[PDB]
Ligand SMILES: N[C@@H](Cc1c[nH]c[nH+]1)C(=O)O
């Protein structure tokens with residue numbers, strides 16, 4: 101007997117599990133459509149060079165990479181943002197900006213699960229925080245669409261610019277800022293030692309620690325000034341979300357930095373308000389990424405990733421993932437095999453009218469056919485019997501007793 | 512500058528190209544739903560052992576395989592049928608039969624393109640040709656849904672049982688039947704040699720050649736008898752398709768065997784009637800596969816694959832793939848930045864009502880905002896200006912001039 105289990109860390113989706121995934125993905129797609137985002141995709145296999153960012157990121161540390169027969173360094177994508185950036189860079193001047201692009205890629209890792217789907221939403225060519233506002237509202241919109249409330253979840257929001265200033269004021273060369281963010285993200289203090297290793301004195305580490313523990317934007321304003329970009333941008337951000345009607349979903353948290361090297365501005369992450377789960381989604385502004393890829397002009401970008409695993413756990417806890425049973429509109433039942441041709445003509449007509457319909461394919465008796473119809477969630481059984489067929493009719497039975505119906509009146 | 516081209520043999524789908532793929536996939540999904548098939552999925556990464564069939568199949572010869580860090584032989588799936596079989600086998604007794612399962616996996620190869628998407632449709636637990644009938648009708652239904660006619664395309668149909676009988680009558684051990692099919696699929700001089708290599712006398716090769724050139728079912732009946740399984744099954748098959756109303760789409764062709772080891776019964780393939788393209792789709796009955804995987808009871812199966820590349824070429828030729836431009840229902844335009852909060856409230860209301868809507872995110876003048884709206888295919892522009900806002904109104908302009916509308920009446 102062959103191995104029936106999937107490869108280590110990967111999931112099968114038989115139809116029951118696929119209905120759940122589809123429920124989630126319908127929301128991702130519908131939210132993207134509601135927000136005017138365009139779908140794109142790119143190969144799951146990318147060149148390894150795309151992810152060599154040299155900032156000690158967990159995401160690049162745990163890459164599912166391998167070497168092709170021809171000796172080329174490739175990887176199954178750990179994330180989608182680099183692929184997006186590749187595509188944008190390849191279009192160059194021909195791309196109309198602003199652009200709002202989304203996708204739902206499977207992404208990979210090697211170390212637990214080795215595989216997940218991640219809804220990506222990114223806005224390209226918008227300098228102002230209106231982008232982050234829209235992105236955050238999109239994430240909330242998807243969660244609300246799944247039945248969650250602002251009591252259940254929220255989005256923590258911060259700007260990396262506050263920390264940037266603190267690091268710059270201490271004389272720390274700007275090429276250490278990304279590593280500093282990767283490290284400070286690990287506050288989940290073994291962190292104090294890593295910063296020293298990166299090459300920062302205790303007074304600099306102290307100031308970092310203090311700013312991550314500031315509990316309001318006003319306290320940020322006190323320290324760096326109300327004119328500081330981070331303050332103005334965060335204030336605009338909250339004003340706009342408030343205006344859009346999702347004020348209860350969002351809040352300021354000075355300890356949110358994210359683990360990715362490339363965030364330059366606002367960053368955010370979704371969380372359950374019971375403190376039971378890891379982040380539901382995560383994102384930020386990344387204005388220099390395209391420049392590091394060789395773009396001749398800077399290109400503003402912001403976006404988020406929203407995984408398919410934590411959300412499902414949360415929804416299970418909140419009893420928002422009831423079993424969705426399979427459904428089909430009609431099941432056409434030949435009285436016997438001599439009625440199969442007529443039944444096929446009936447089946448054709450039902451499908452032509454936009455109905456989902458089965459025909460009983462195997463040889464079986466009517467009662468068993470009826471049971472089968474019930475099992476597949478048929479709304480209606482259509483019995484094609486010789487007596488009614490002579491009258492230009494079939495027998496119809498609703499499952500959600502027994503009437504004869506003219507062939508033209510079935511739809 | 513990073514490499515902007517995708518990895519060798521793989522495709523990018525920026526939004527323009529994604530709209531085309533989506534148009535196709537909508538049809539696959541909608542056809543599956545119309546025919547009552549259930550969606551499933553499985554990991555793109557499978558164990559190599561799953562595909563070691565030892566029949567010299569092109570599909571197993573060109574596997575994209577590699578070795579994990581831990582030393583496990585894995586592959587990116589060349590096809591989906593083995594994964595399906597794995598899943599079915601893992602469910603075992605708990606799976607209700609009949610089952611009709613579909614998916615649209617990306618499948619891979621190494622050698623030209625290294626990657627394609629393939630609509631898979633399979634029926635499990637049906638012994639009778641009604642399964643093949645439904646599968647073939649499904650393929651036709653998808654093609655007709657895309658705008659093709661029976662003048663444009665058809666499905667060639669055969670049974671491997673005819674050739675089975677010929678091989679058995681020559682004393683050829685049954686373990687050579689699959690290799691024989693793989694070889695005969697490669698068609699005159701060149702194929703004749705491979706059969707000899709496989710270990711078959713010229714008289715046996717002659718008889719094979721003759722049966723592949725028989726031009727009707729009647730000629731098959733003359734050779735192997737009218738009561739031969741293949742003849743009765745093919746006759747039932749055509750009677751049923753005729754009854755379903757797709758008789759013009761299907762025909763008998765004795766040279767169709769397919770290249771896969773596992774087909775035991777009826778086989779078929781879609782083709783353009785101009786003879787310009789490779790096969791549009793391909794499939795058949797494979798009643799022993801689950802038995803070879805270790806199933807304790809035989810499990811009848813039939814299905815097909817329908818790739819995403821040949822169909823698109825054909826549709827391009829027939830001018831059935833017009834550019835589908837992006838569309839959005841509304842574009843909300845703040846008169847200026849002081850109107851952004853009100854505009855956001857308007858945007859919220861539009862989206863709450865199920866409309867797709869943008870808001871102009873960066874700072875720009877109204878006419879440029881209008882142009883942008885036209886560029887993204889907005890049906891309607893909604894100008895949020897201070898004069899109208901005092902009256903509880905906005906200005907609306909249809910893009911396919913200028914009226915004031917109450918906020919509650921926008922939807
Ligand atoms: N790539 C990020 C999410 C993201 C999308 N766009 C910007 N950021 C992550 O995996 O966490």
Ligand SMILES: N[C@@H](Cc1c[nH]c[nH+]1)C(=O)O
Nearest residue numbers: 590592793794814815816
């Ligand atoms: N796996 C086959 C198609 C198929 C699906 N189910 C049965 N046959 C192919 O790739 O050609």
Ligand SMILES: OCc1ccc(Cl)cc1
Nearest residue numbers: 159208209213214215216
């Ligand atoms: O490294 C990001 C990542 C996280 C989770 C999975 Cl399963 C795959 C990738």
Ligand SMILES: OCc1ccc(Cl)cc1
Nearest residue numbers: 570618619620625626627
């Ligand atoms: O032979 C299977 C296969 C065929 C075509 C592509 Cl592109 C990928 C896989």
